[PDB]
Design a protein around this motif. Structure first.
Motif, PDB file in Angstrom:
ATOM      1  N   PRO A 130      -4.768   3.369  -2.653  1.00  0.00           N
ATOM      2  CA  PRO A 130      -4.359   4.053  -2.578  1.00  0.00           C
ATOM      3  C   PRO A 130      -3.486   5.403  -2.863  1.00  0.00           C
ATOM      4  O   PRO A 130      -4.189   5.196  -4.038  1.00  0.00           O
ATOM      5  CB  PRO A 130      -2.673   4.258  -1.568  1.00  0.00           C
ATOM      6  CG  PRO A 130      -2.310   2.332  -2.245  1.00  0.00           C
ATOM      7  CD  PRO A 130      -4.093   2.241  -2.522  1.00  0.00           C
TER       8      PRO A 130
ATOM      9  N   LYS B 268       8.311   7.614  -8.556  1.00  0.00           N
ATOM     10  CA  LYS B 268       8.539   8.055 -10.115  1.00  0.00           C
ATOM     11  C   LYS B 268      10.235   7.295  -9.937  1.00  0.00           C
ATOM     12  O   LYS B 268      10.781   8.229  -9.061  1.00  0.00           O
ATOM     13  CB  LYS B 268       8.555   9.276 -10.560  1.00  0.00           C
ATOM     14  CG  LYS B 268       6.407   8.880 -10.655  1.00  0.00           C
ATOM     15  CD  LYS B 268       6.086  10.216 -12.123  1.00  0.00           C
ATOM     16  CE  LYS B 268       4.749  10.287 -12.152  1.00  0.00           C
ATOM     17  NZ  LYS B 268       4.104  11.183 -13.103  1.00  0.00           N
TER      18      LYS B 268
ATOM     19  N   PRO C 296       1.391  11.160  -8.215  1.00  0.00           N
ATOM     20  CA  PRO C 296       1.869  11.105  -9.372  1.00  0.00           C
ATOM     21  C   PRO C 296       1.026  10.207 -10.134  1.00  0.00           C
ATOM     22  O   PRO C 296       1.654  10.714 -10.987  1.00  0.00           O
ATOM     23  CB  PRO C 296       3.150  10.535  -8.365  1.00  0.00           C
ATOM     24  CG  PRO C 296       2.705   9.406  -7.785  1.00  0.00           C
ATOM     25  CD  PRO C 296       2.531  10.350  -6.387  1.00  0.00           C
TER      26      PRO C 296
ATOM     27  N   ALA D 184      -0.837  12.594 -11.813  1.00  0.00           N
ATOM     28  CA  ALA D 184       0.151  13.878 -12.396  1.00  0.00           C
ATOM     29  C   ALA D 184       0.148  13.902 -14.302  1.00  0.00           C
ATOM     30  O   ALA D 184      -0.130  12.758 -14.286  1.00  0.00           O
ATOM     31  CB  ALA D 184       1.516  14.104 -12.144  1.00  0.00           C
ATOM     32  N   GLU D 185       0.185  14.642 -15.122  1.00  0.00           N
ATOM     33  CA  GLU D 185       0.948  14.925 -16.406  1.00  0.00           C
ATOM     34  C   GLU D 185       1.577  14.553 -16.785  1.00  0.00           C
ATOM     35  O   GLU D 185       3.034  14.305 -16.176  1.00  0.00           O
ATOM     36  CB  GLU D 185       0.033  16.764 -17.150  1.00  0.00           C
ATOM     37  CG  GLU D 185       0.416  16.706 -18.330  1.00  0.00           C
ATOM     38  CD  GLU D 185       0.396  18.201 -18.665  1.00  0.00           C
ATOM     39  OE1 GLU D 185      -0.290  18.434 -18.141  1.00  0.00           O
ATOM     40  OE2 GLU D 185       0.806  18.399 -19.836  1.00  0.00           O
TER      41      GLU D 185
ATOM     42  N   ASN E 226      -3.657  13.253  -5.132  1.00  0.00           N
ATOM     43  CA  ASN E 226      -2.403  13.799  -5.311  1.00  0.00           C
ATOM     44  C   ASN E 226      -1.640  13.464  -5.348  1.00  0.00           C
ATOM     45  O   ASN E 226      -0.172  13.134  -5.140  1.00  0.00           O
ATOM     46  CB  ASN E 226      -2.350  14.671  -4.044  1.00  0.00           C
ATOM     47  CG  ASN E 226      -3.720  15.575  -3.260  1.00  0.00           C
ATOM     48  OD1 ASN E 226      -3.364  16.789  -3.960  1.00  0.00           O
ATOM     49  ND2 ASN E 226      -3.444  15.903  -2.460  1.00  0.00           N
TER      50      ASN E 226
ATOM     51  N   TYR F  17       0.613  -1.227   0.010  1.00  0.00           N
ATOM     52  CA  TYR F  17      -0.363   0.098   0.077  1.00  0.00           C
ATOM     53  C   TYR F  17       1.364   1.495   0.748  1.00  0.00           C
ATOM     54  O   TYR F  17       0.083   2.635  -0.377  1.00  0.00           O
ATOM     55  CB  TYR F  17      -0.511  -0.098   1.335  1.00  0.00           C
ATOM     56  CG  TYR F  17      -2.042  -0.692   1.333  1.00  0.00           C
ATOM     57  CD1 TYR F  17      -1.450  -2.281   1.781  1.00  0.00           C
ATOM     58  CD2 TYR F  17      -3.410  -0.451   0.471  1.00  0.00           C
ATOM     59  CE1 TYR F  17      -2.805  -3.271   1.586  1.00  0.00           C
ATOM     60  CE2 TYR F  17      -4.218  -1.919   0.699  1.00  0.00           C
ATOM     61  CZ  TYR F  17      -4.276  -3.081   0.654  1.00  0.00           C
ATOM     62  OH  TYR F  17      -5.475  -4.003   1.138  1.00  0.00           O
TER      63      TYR F  17
ATOM     64  N   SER G  70      -9.931   1.022   4.158  1.00  0.00           N
ATOM     65  CA  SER G  70      -9.232   1.706   3.119  1.00  0.00           C
ATOM     66  C   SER G  70      -8.394   0.440   2.619  1.00  0.00           C
ATOM     67  O   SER G  70      -7.102   0.614   1.095  1.00  0.00           O
ATOM     68  CB  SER G  70      -7.794   2.661   3.459  1.00  0.00           C
ATOM     69  OG  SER G  70      -6.980   1.706   5.041  1.00  0.00           O
ATOM     70  N   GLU G  71      -8.206  -0.752   2.505  1.00  0.00           N
ATOM     71  CA  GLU G  71      -7.166  -2.171   2.115  1.00  0.00           C
ATOM     72  C   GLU G  71      -8.442  -2.044   0.906  1.00  0.00           C
ATOM     73  O   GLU G  71      -8.061  -2.195  -0.078  1.00  0.00           O
ATOM     74  CB  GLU G  71      -7.227  -3.586   3.297  1.00  0.00           C
ATOM     75  CG  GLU G  71      -7.156  -2.796   4.444  1.00  0.00           C
ATOM     76  CD  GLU G  71      -7.646  -2.412   5.646  1.00  0.00           C
ATOM     77  OE1 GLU G  71      -8.836  -2.244   5.275  1.00  0.00           O
ATOM     78  OE2 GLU G  71      -7.226  -1.905   6.619  1.00  0.00           O
ATOM     79  N   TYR G  72      -9.391  -1.847   0.623  1.00  0.00           N
ATOM     80  CA  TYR G  72      -9.656  -2.721  -0.548  1.00  0.00           C
ATOM     81  C   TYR G  72     -10.276  -1.763  -1.283  1.00  0.00           C
ATOM     82  O   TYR G  72     -10.902  -1.124  -2.745  1.00  0.00           O
ATOM     83  CB  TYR G  72     -11.681  -2.742  -0.333  1.00  0.00           C
ATOM     84  CG  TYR G  72     -11.701  -4.347   0.636  1.00  0.00           C
ATOM     85  CD1 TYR G  72     -11.421  -5.241  -0.156  1.00  0.00           C
ATOM     86  CD2 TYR G  72     -11.453  -4.104   1.887  1.00  0.00           C
ATOM     87  CE1 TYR G  72     -11.090  -6.557   0.276  1.00  0.00           C
ATOM     88  CE2 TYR G  72     -11.582  -5.525   2.370  1.00  0.00           C
ATOM     89  CZ  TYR G  72     -11.009  -5.956   2.114  1.00  0.00           C
ATOM     90  OH  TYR G  72     -11.373  -7.793   2.769  1.00  0.00           O
TER      91      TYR G  72
END
Lengths: 240, 103, 49, 301, 49, 60
Positions: free
Chosen positions: E36, C49, E42, E45-46, E40, C44, E31-33
C-alpha cells in the motif's frame, strides 16, 4: 476506527465529493456510490472503472427512518437504490482515488459538497480534444455541452480524467488538474480554452470532467429542491 | 486490355450489389435524404490485410476520406448552423442584477 | 493404444506391492494456512512518520 | 440584462448537436485504430465545424457501432443464443439489430441506444449490409433463410424505431462496400497481389475438349506467362498434369487455354487404363510474371 | 496431425488417475499482494538531511 | 539552497566567469549561457561540448 454510511440524492452522484479540513490544508475526498449485490450479500462500488474496489458487509447500513422518495433521487448506472460509504481508514484523495491518503487522527470538520446540477460549466460539459500549442508554455483544450449562462475566467481549476497514447504506442490513462489562462466563444456553448502545462501524449478520449467553482458568477433559472440525508449509520472500533 | 479486371472475384460480390440495390431503393421511397457517401470506387489496395482473414476493413487514410464525404453530404442538407443561443453579445455587455421575481 | 497404459498400471502395482506409500492429505486452501487480517488489517494501514 | 436595453435573460440552454453513428464495424473503423487528429471522425468533426464557423466542440459525434452484427437473427452468427457478446468471444450470441419473427428490437440495437444515453441526436449515419451479404451467400441450415424482403423490412422498421425514440431527424446511409476473402487457406500470410489470376472458368463440348478461362488482375495478361496445374482426381492434394500457356492467348474478354481430347486422353491412361470422361476436375492457374509464381484459388466444380 | 494430441491427453489422464493434484488458486493481482502507499506515500518523499 | 538567474551581455559570453571568495582562497566559476528549449520546455546549456549538462525548469 469509524465508518459512516447514509443515503443522499445529489445532482451528480458519480461526482459527489466531501471536503476534509485537516489542520494542514483542505483535502477533497470523492464518495463513489455503492450498490448492494444480492448474490454475494455485500456492498460493492458501482463505478467499475475508477471505483474504490472495496467491499462492505450488509451490516454497515441499517434503514430505520423514512427512505428518500424515488422521484426525488437521480439514477446512476441504471440504479436508484445506492448508498454512500465514508471510511476513515481509506481516505484516499484524487478523482480516481490515486491521491495522498488523509490521516484520520486530526480532522477539524467534515463538509459535504452539495451543489446544483447546472453549477459551474454545467452537468453536460465534456471535452472534445486536447493538443499542445506550438508555444512552449501552454496547450489548447476544447470543451462542449456548456449551458449558455456559464462564464469562464483565468485562474480556474479543472479536474479531468483522460486516456492518451503513449510515445511507445501503448494506451495510457492519467488524471490531473489544469489552470485556465484564456478562452473564446462566450455564450455559444462551445469554449476554446487555453491552459498551461504539457500533454504527455496524443489525446484519445475523456472519461471524467468537473469544471466546478468558477470565479465568474452567472444567473440560472430559479428552482427549489430538498436535499436528503437519510439513515446516518455509524459503526466501527473508534469511539462513537 | 479487356482481359484484365481491377477487382478480384469474391463469392459475396453479388449479394453485396444486391443489398446495395435494397439500400438504394429504400432511399428513393423514404422522406429524408439517405445517401451518405459512395464507397464503390475503392479497391483491395484500400483495405488493410489481416492474416488468416483477408482484407475486409478500410485503411486509416481511406476511412478518413469516407468521413470527409459524409461531412459534405450533411452540409448540403444543412448549409447553416440551425441553433441560436438566447444571448448574443459578449459577457461585458450584460449586467448581473437580482430581482424579487418576474412579478 | 493396444492397451499400453493398462500394462503399465498392472506392472507398477505388482512391483511396488507390499509397502505403504500413502501421501499426506492436507488442504492448503483453508484459513489456517492463510494469514488473518485481510486488506482491512492495520498491517496494510499507512505508516505515519 | 443588456447595457443599452433592459430586456431580462434568465434561462440557460445547451446548443449541442449530436450525430449518431451505428451499424457494421466498417463504420467503427472511423473511431478506432488511431488517435487525435488522425482518426476518421476527427476530420468529420473538423471539416464540419469550420464550415459553420462554430468551435471544434460544436459537433459531438457518438459511436454506437458493433462488429459482426446483422439486421435480423437470420443473418446472425448465433441466431439462437441471446447473450450479447460484441467481442465474438465464448458464445457469440445476439448481434442482431431486430427480430422480425417477434417484431422486437435486438440486443445490438439496445446497446446502441445505451451509448446515446442522455444525449439527443439530430442525425444518424448507418451501414450494415456486410453481415447480411455473407449469410445470404451461404444460407446453410438456417430455417429462417435470409432473403431480400427480410433484410428490407428489418432495415425499414429499425429506422422507424430510432425515429420513435427521437425526433424526425434525417438519417444518412453509407453504401455497402466490397470485401475479399483470403485466396489460399494453406498460405494465410499472403495478401492480394497484382497479376493474381481470377474468375476461373471451365467449359467443355460434346466431343470432350476442355477449355480453361481466367482473367488477370493489375497488369496486362499478354505480358506475362501462365501455367495451369491439374490435380489428381484420386489424390486431390497431388498435382497430376501441368502445362505452360504463354501470353496473348486471350479472346472474348478472357484468357483461354486449350485442353483438347488428344491432350487429356494420354494423361488419363496412367491414371485409368481406359479413356474415362472427365466429368469433374480440380485445377489451379499460377501466373509467371517477373519470375514470380502467383497461384490462384482452386476450381473444384 | 493424425490425432497425435488426442492420444497424449488420453494417456496422461489414465496413467496419473487415482490421485489429487489440484493446484492452488491465488490471485496475485489483488491489493493484498501489493504494497500500500503508492507514489503519494511518505516513503517516496524526499529525505531531508 | 539558492539559485540565481539573470540576463547579461558580456563581450565573451562563452568565457563569462564569476569569482567566489571563500575564507580559504578565491575560486573561479564559469557561467555557461543557457537557452530555453521550446519542445521540452526546459532551460538547457548551449555549450554541448563542455557544458554543465544540466536542465532547469522554466520557472527558474
Amino acid at each position: 476506527g469509524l465508518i459512516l454510511a447514509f443515503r443522499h440524492n445529489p445532482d451528480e452522484p458519480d461526482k459527489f465529493t466531501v471536503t476534509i479540513q485537516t489542520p494542514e490544508k483542505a483535502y477533497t475526498y470523492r464518495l463513489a456510490p455503492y450498490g448492494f449485490n444480492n448474490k454475494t450479500r455485500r456492498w460493492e462500488c458501482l463505478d467499475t472503472k475508477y471505483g474504490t474496489k472495496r467491499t462492505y458487509q450488509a451490516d454497515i447500513f441499517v434503514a430505520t427512518d423514512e427512505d428518500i422518495p424515488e422521484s426525488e433521487m437521480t439514477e446512476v448506472y441504471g440504479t436508484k437504490d445506492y448508498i454512500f460509504i465514508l471510511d476513515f481508514a481509506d481516505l484516499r484523495t484524487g478523482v480516481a482515488f490515486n491521491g495522498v491518503t488523509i490521516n484520520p487522527r486530526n480532522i477539524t470538520m467534515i463538509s459535504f459538497d452539495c451543489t446544483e446540477a447546472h453549477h459551474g460549466l454545467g452537468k453536460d460539459a465534456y471535452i472534445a480534444a486536447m493538443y499542445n500549442n506550438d508555444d512552449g508554455a501552454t496547450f489548447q483544450m476544447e470543451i462542449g455541452g456548456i449551458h449558455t449562462n456559464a462564464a469562464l475566467a483565468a485562474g480556474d481549476k479543472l479536474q479531468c480524467i483522460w486516456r492518451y497514447l503513449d510515445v511507445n504506442g501503448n494506451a495510457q490513462a492519467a488524471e490531473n488538474e489544469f489552470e485556465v489562462v484564456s478562452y473564446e466563444g462566450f455564450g455559444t456553448s462551445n469554449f476554446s480554452v487555453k491552459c498551461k502545462g504539457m500533454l504527455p501524449g496524443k489525446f484519445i478520449g475523456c472519461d471524467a470532467f468537473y469544471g466546478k467553482y468558477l470565479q465568474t458568477d452567472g444567473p440560472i433559472k430559479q428552482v427549489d429542491s430538498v436535499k436528503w440525508f437519510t439513515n446516518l449509520t455509524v459503526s466501527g472500533s473508534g469511539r462513537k | 486490355n479487356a482481359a484484365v479486371v481491377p477487382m478480384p472475384y469474391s463469392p459475396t460480390t453479388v449479394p453485396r450489389e444486391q443489398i446495395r440495390e435494397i439500400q438504394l431503393q429504400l432511399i428513393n421511397e423514404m422522406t429524408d435524404v439517405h445517401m451518405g457517401a459512395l464507397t464503390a470506387q475503392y479497391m483491395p489496395d484500400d483495405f488493410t490485410f489481416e492474416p488468416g482473414i483477408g482484407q475486409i476493413h478500410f485503411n486509416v487514410e481511406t476511412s478518413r476520406k469516407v468521413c470527409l464525404d459524409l461531412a459534405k453530404s450533411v452540409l448540403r442538407l444543412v448549409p447553416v448552423y440551425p441553433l441560436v443561443s438566447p444571448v448574443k453579445k459578449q459577457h461585458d455587455d450584460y449586467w448581473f442584477v437580482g430581482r424579487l421575481g418576474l412579478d | 493404444s493396444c492397451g499400453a497404459e493398462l500394462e503399465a498400471n498392472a506392472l507398477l502395482t505388482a512391483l511396488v506391492a507390499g509397502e505403504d506409500f500413502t501421501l499426506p492429505d492436507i488442504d492448503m486452501s483453508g484459513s489456517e494456512y492463510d494469514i488473518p487480517g485481510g486488506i482491512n488489517s492495520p498491517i496494510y494501514a499507512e505508516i505515519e512518520k | 440584462q443588456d447595457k443599452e436595453t433592459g430586456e431580462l435573460i434568465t434561462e440557460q440552454t445547451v446548443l449541442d448537436y449530436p450525430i449518431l453513428f451505428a451499424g457494421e464495424s466498417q463504420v467503427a473503423i472511423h473511431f478506432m485504430s488511431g488517435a487525435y487528429p488522425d482518426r476518421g471522425y476527427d476530420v468529420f468533426q473538423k471539416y464540419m465545424t469550420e464550415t459553420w464557423g462554430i468551435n471544434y466542440a460544436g459537433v459531438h459525434p457518438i459511436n454506437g457501432t458493433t462488429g459482426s452484427t446483422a439486421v435480423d437473427r437470420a443473418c446472425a452468427v448465433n441466431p439462437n443464443s441471446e447473450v450479447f457478446d460484441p467481442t465474438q468471444s465464448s458464445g457469440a450470441g445476439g448481434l442482431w439489430w431486430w427480430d422480425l419473427e417477434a417484431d422486437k428490437p435486438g440486443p445490438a440495437l439496445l446497446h446502441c441506444v445505451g451509448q446515446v444515453g442522455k444525449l439527443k441526436p439530430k442525425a444518424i449515419i448507418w451501414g450494415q449490409g456486410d453481415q447480411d451479404a455473407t449469410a445470404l451467400a451461404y444460407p446453410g441450415d438456417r430455417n429462417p433463410a435470409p432473403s431480400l424482403t427480410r433484410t428490407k423490412q428489418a432495415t425499414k422498421k429499425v429506422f422507424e424505431y430510432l425515429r420513435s425514440l427521437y425526433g424526425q431527424i434525417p438519417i444518412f446511409i453509407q453504401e455497402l462496400s466490397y470485401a475479399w476473402g483470403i485466396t489460399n487457406t494453406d498460405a494465410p500470410n499472403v495478401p492480394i497481389r497484382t497479376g493474381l489470376p481470377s474468375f476461373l472458368a471451365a467449359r467443355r463440348n460434346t466431343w470432350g475438349d476442355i477449355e480453361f478461362r481466367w482473367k488477370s488482375y493489375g497488369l496486362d495478361p499478354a505480358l506475362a506467362q501462365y501455367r495451369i496445374e491439374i490435380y489428381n482426381p484420386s489424390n486431390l492434394n497431388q498435382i497430376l498434369h501441368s502445362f505452360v500457356v504463354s501470353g496473348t492467348q486471350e479472346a472474348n474478354g478472357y484468357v483461354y487455354a486449350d485442353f483438347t481430347v488428344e491432350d487429356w486422353i494420354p494423361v488419363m491412361m496412367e491414371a485409368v487404363g481406359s479413356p474415362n470422361p472427365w466429368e469433374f476436375m480440380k485445377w489451379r492457374v499460377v501466373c509467371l510474371y517477373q519470375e514470380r509464381e502467383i497461384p490462384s484459388a482452386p476450381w473444384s466444380d
